[PDB]
Amino acid sequence: GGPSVFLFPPKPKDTLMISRTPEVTCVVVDVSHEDPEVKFNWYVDGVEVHNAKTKPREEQYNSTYRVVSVLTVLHQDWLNGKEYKCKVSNKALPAPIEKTISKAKGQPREPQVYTLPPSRDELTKNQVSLTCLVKGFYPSDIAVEWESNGQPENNYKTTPPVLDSDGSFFLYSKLTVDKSRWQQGNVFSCSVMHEALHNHYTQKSLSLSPGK
Amino acid sequence: GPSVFLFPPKPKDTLMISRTPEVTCVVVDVSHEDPEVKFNWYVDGVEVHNAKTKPREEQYNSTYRVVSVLTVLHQDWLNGKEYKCKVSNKALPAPIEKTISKAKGQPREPQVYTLPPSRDELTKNQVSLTCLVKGFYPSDIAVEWESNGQPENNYKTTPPVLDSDGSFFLYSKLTVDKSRWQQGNVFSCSVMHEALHNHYTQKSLSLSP
Ligand SMILES: *[C@@H]1O[C@H](CO)[C@@H](O[C@@H]2O[C@H](CO)[C@@H](O[C@H]3O[C@H](CO[C@H]4O[C@H](CO)[C@@H](O)[C@H](O)[C@@H]4O[C@@H]4O[C@H](CO)[C@@H](O[C@@H]5O[C@H](CO)[C@H](O)[C@H](O)[C@H]5O)[C@H](O)[C@H]4NC(C)=O)[C@@H](O)[C@H](O[C@H]4O[C@H](CO)[C@@H](O)[C@H](O)[C@@H]4O[C@@H]4O[C@H](CO)[C@@H](O)[C@H](O)[C@H]4NC(C)=O)[C@@H]3O)[C@H](O)[C@H]2NC(C)=O)[C@H](O)[C@H]1NC(C)=O
Ligand SMILES: *[C@@H]1O[C@H](CO)[C@@H](O[C@@H]2O[C@H](CO)[C@@H](O[C@H]3O[C@H](CO[C@H]4O[C@H](CO)[C@@H](O)[C@H](O)[C@@H]4O[C@@H]4O[C@H](CO)[C@@H](O[C@@H]5O[C@H](CO)[C@H](O)[C@H](O)[C@H]5O)[C@H](O)[C@H]4NC(C)=O)[C@@H](O)[C@H](O[C@H]4O[C@H](CO)[C@@H](O)[C@H](O)[C@@H]4O[C@@H]4O[C@H](CO)[C@@H](O)[C@H](O)[C@H]4NC(C)=O)[C@@H]3O)[C@H](O)[C@H]2NC(C)=O)[C@H](O)[C@H]1NC(C)=O
């Protein structure tokens, strides 16, 4: 029966930018009225820390309690693969639940970023597919965005990372634009940001340039 | 009850008359003290049991992993029919529920575009051939690559993503020693989907000057 705990890593973007603030979030659900008290203990690489901001108990519609705890994580700590452990106690369980999260273990590998123009058979349609291929990155955490003329193209989709045959990861992003917008010869760019990239950021762009 | 799981057939099994599509009922966390599990199967309500309840198996922890399997008609599954697996275990409360069927809605036909590696990838000893498959519904799909009617092995295919029109897409990526691409060898993306004339289309890709 009883309470369950879930531990959530930061957003890859948060991790990779000095500006942003990465957080690790430990959430408890199914906390009865009979024993509503929950204690959190946090550990970084096995050693307790006490800077974690813990929200007041929010009652839920199944009459079950739910309490969140948020540890602010130093960027470089995450990127050096520090281990974050949430330890949850409730007088409703034999032993206090433990969860541990980190960046995945391995050597980082740098993203290769290629753009692919739409297929020839695709010109016949009203909308076109602009492809962004990102291969050979590790670990899998990553963000992918499209823009044109300094402004975000918000009509794209990105697949999850996929475990390649050589242990690394690949993925694809597909921006769909009104075919006319490609005709005009616009410039479209696929911004990618990952730990193994210089400045944690690269961008490549694409357009139609026939003749040579 | 201990966790119970229903599973569809694979896209491919369901798309060729020759194959044998099966629905699966994996029952986890069955314990030594009370195991003698019943399974019963119903399609669109009705009693059937042409199902073969696989002989048991244990696992890593103190737990058994047990399974049943039922063979299925290609049309029945393509026609939406629900498949339910009631799983009688008198260790805990009552019968168990799990329905599954195919996703509902007008099957849409996949568009298939082969893309070639970018110039930039050409300064490497292996290249990437891209196969875009978009606009398809439902997401049950199967993708393969080949050359000279012999099958290419070094490719991986991404899962399908909900595109913004409620259709799906995916990409499949074939990896070849850049020497082969030079030759001009033809490479084939083969997509199998219910909304396809004959459940199969194939697009070709080669070095065009
Ligand atoms: C009573 O009512 C309440 C609520 O109404 C019920 O609570 C629910 O209980 C469920 C358990 O039965 C919970 O389980 C699922 O939860 C997670 C997914 O939770 C996230 O996503 C859902 C939407 O899908 C959201 O609703 C949640 O709020 C969670 O959202 C994320 O929250 C994070 C922190 O808030 C967000 O982080 C942000 O990002 C910032 C970046 O810096 C910053 O860090 C902050 O973190 C924050 O800003 C994050 O972005 C949110 N994401 C989204 C998309 O919104 C799900 O993972 C669980 O699945 C796991 O566990 C099951 C087992 O139960 C596994 O089968 C499953 O596959 C997976 O576990 C896998 O296996 C192992 C070990 O288990 C792991 O090591 C693997 O990694 C793991 N993953 C795999 C295999 O893929 C689970 O299904 C549900 O969250 C609860 N809801 C709420 C609101 O809390 C309660 O159950 C009810 N009880 C009853 C009896 O009725
Ligand atoms: C002791 O150790 C053992 C061994 O480790 C533990 O066993 C584990 O038991 C778990 C029960 O808790 C199992 O559940 C998890 O996994 C299922 C998915 O199952 C597949 O996934 C993994 C691969 O990652 C495999 O290990 C499994 O075996 C399953 O493999 C697929 O199953 C089929 C087998 O028949 C294959 O297809 C068949 O193939 C045939 C030919 O080969 C033929 O073609 C057939 O036609 C075809 O069917 C298929 O190919 C297999 N392989 C792959 C790679 O796919 C997962 O669904 C569970 O999570 C879901 O449900 C939980 C509820 O507990 C939710 O929390 C969670 O969110 C999640 O989704 C939600 O579930 C609800 C239902 O509750 C749905 O209605 C919702 O829609 C859904 N949400 C959303 C948003 O969609 C769960 O994660 C697990 O399989 C076992 N693990 C292992 C390693 O074996 C055991 O736990 C241990 N015991 C104890 C006490 O600790």
Curated annotation (Swiss-Prot), chain A:
GO biological process entries: adaptive immune response; antibacterial humoral response; antibody-dependent cellular cytotoxicity; B cell receptor signaling pathway; complement activation, classical pathway; complement-dependent cytotoxicity
Occurrences of domain Ig-like (ranges): 3-102, 111-207
Region span, CH2: 1-105
UniProt region (CH3), positions on chain: 106-212
Annotated GO CC locations: blood microparticle; extracellular exosome; extracellular region; extracellular space; IgG immunoglobulin complex; immunoglobulin complex, circulating; plasma membrane
Extracellular side: 1-212
Positions of disulphide bridges: 26-86, 132-190
Glycosylation sites: 62
Record carries keyword Transmembrane: yes
Post-translation changes: Glycosylation on Asn-62 is required for interaction with Fc receptors and ability to activate the complement pathway.
Keywords: Adaptive immunity, Cell membrane, Chromosomal rearrangement, Disulfide bond, Glycoprotein, Immunity, Immunoglobulin, Immunoglobulin domain, Membrane, Secreted, Transmembrane, Transmembrane helix
Taxonomic superkingdom: Eukaryota
GO terms for MF: antigen binding; Fc-gamma receptor I complex binding; immunoglobulin receptor binding
Associated disease: Multiple myeloma: A malignant tumor of plasma cells usually arising in the bone marrow and characterized by diffuse involvement of the skeletal system, hyperglobulinemia, Bence-Jones proteinuria and anemia. Complications of multiple myeloma are bone pain, hypercalcemia, renal failure and spinal cord compression. The aberrant antibodies that are produced lead to impaired humoral immunity and patients have a high prevalence of infection. Amyloidosis may develop in some patients.
Subunit structure: Immunoglobulins are composed of two identical heavy chains and two identical light chains; disulfide-linked. Interacts with FCGR1A; this interaction mediates IgG effector functions on monocytes. Interacts with FCGR2A and FCGR3A.
UniProt function note: Constant region of immunoglobulin heavy chains. Immunoglobulins, also known as antibodies, are membrane-bound or secreted glycoproteins produced by B lymphocytes. In the recognition phase of humoral immunity, the membrane-bound immunoglobulins serve as receptors which, upon binding of a specific antigen, trigger the clonal expansion and differentiation of B lymphocytes into immunoglobulins-secreting plasma cells. Secreted immunoglobulins mediate the effector phase of humoral immunity, which results in the elimination of bound antigens.
Name of the protein this chain belongs to: Immunoglobulin heavy constant gamma 1
